[PDB]
Amino acid sequence: PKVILLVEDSKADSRLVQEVLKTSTIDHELIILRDGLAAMAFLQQQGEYENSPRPNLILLDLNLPKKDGREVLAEIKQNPDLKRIPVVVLTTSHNEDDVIASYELHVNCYLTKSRNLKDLFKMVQGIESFWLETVTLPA
């Protein structure tokens, strides 16, 4: 099963992500982390997370506590062991600098969280149907 890593400090948002993936026909495991430090410790599979499984797909919000998500994305994609893992940025940040800088950093796609839940639920369903069903994730 595909291991999906979500780094989201918003509970309302991660709850909606869990709900969308909870009704997916594709098997998978969802690991949720709440800050940039946890995400990095995990990805670098260090102590707290030494035996931790690597993710086949990462959903990332740029605005995170402890360590900036913009930083997490850069280190993931500058690291030869993790750069191959598709990263999906899903964030509240509408800032133009962030959009460009992220794609230049090699983020796979950048998504902006709808203000209205109904649309966000639709957006997350789109992520699920595309990245978990149509896309062939790397090994």
Next chain:
Amino acid sequence: NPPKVILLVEDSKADSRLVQEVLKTSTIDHELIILRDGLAAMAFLQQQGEYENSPRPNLILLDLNLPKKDGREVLAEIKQNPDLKRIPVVVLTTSHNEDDVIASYELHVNCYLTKSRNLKDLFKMVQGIESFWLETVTLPA
């Protein structure tokens, strides 16, 4: 509200067609530009010759097994070009070799898609690309 420009680099006229039909039922303002080989693809992208002032694509659908120039090489050069780098590239090819998949990812492909051997399931696939990349995704300038 500028038109969405899509570059389809595909040698199979059939698969080529299916993509046109799929996009023909979209309400999204767009322009689909189809190319038949890898050399032609880099020429268009580097706006030379007949492709002078060629429109900058917002999305690129790339088949890998192409004549004249490997789609893998095209992806390689596209993602190393400071000018083309950010343009999302959606590999959409026949093979699903763990080797090609991993290679394409190491070369910075945004996502890799294997053409379904099932005509129907492929329509859906193409529908997803249109839906996700042209409506849901926040594309870069």
